[PDB]
Amino acid sequence: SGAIYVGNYRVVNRHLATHNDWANLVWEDSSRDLLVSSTTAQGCDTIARCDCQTGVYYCSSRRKHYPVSFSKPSLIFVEASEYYPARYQSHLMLAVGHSEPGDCGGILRCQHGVVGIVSTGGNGLVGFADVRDLLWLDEE
Numbered sequence: 001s002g003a004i005y006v007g008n009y010r011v012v013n014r015h016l017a018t019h020n021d022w023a024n025l026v027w028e029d030s031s032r033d034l035l036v037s038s039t040t041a042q043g044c045d046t047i048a049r050c051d052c053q054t055g056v057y058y059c060s061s062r063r064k065h066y067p068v069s070f071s072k073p074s075l076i077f078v079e080a081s082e083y084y085p086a087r088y089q090s091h092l093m094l095a096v097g098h099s100e101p102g103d104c105g106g107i108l109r110c111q112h113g114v115v116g117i118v119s120t121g122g123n124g125l126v127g128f129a130d131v132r133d134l135l136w137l138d139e140e
């Protein structure tokens with residue numbers, strides 16, 4: 001589990017969105033596994049606006065933050081799960097690192113701010129849904 005709290009927005013994995021998230025919906029995209037809902041309180045996270053390929057992510061199944069090198073956001077084939085059929089997920093970055101089901105939502109960050117959240121994993125790989133291109137998260 002986990003979310004990014006930037007301005008009056010809450011960014012979560014779409015597959016983990018609550019009824020309150022859907023009832024206060026700002027934007028969602030199944031192909032990216034992302035959903036953004038509105039919040040009453042202002043958040044403290046800042047979004048990175050950069051092309052960093054190195055950062056640190058939070059792994060809840062180890063209570064640890066790990067430094068990683070990650071690929072550029074791309075279209076990648078993801079196997080079937082209880083949440084989606086096997087399909088291509090867009091804006092996904094891969095890295096070598098531990099991840100289990102339950103680790104989705106962990107933040108990946110670089111020197112500039114939040115880069116994205118854990119969305120996929122398996123056998124020593126971890127995949128992050130990028131949010132750096134969502135410029136509108138910084139305003140309104």
Ligand SMILES: Cn1ncc(-c2cc(Cl)cc(Cl)c2)c1CC(=O)N1CCC[C@H](C(N)=O)C1
Binds near residue numbers: 122
């Ligand atoms: C986060 N994580 N880390 C490891 C595994 C994983 C490991 C094993 Cl052994 C078996 C399975 Cl089915 C999954 C997962 C879960 C995962 O990748 N997904 C399930 C939730 C929706 C995700 C999506 N974005 O499509 C895909």
Ligand SMILES: [Zn+2]
Binds near residue numbers: 048050051052110111
């Ligand atoms: Zn950066």
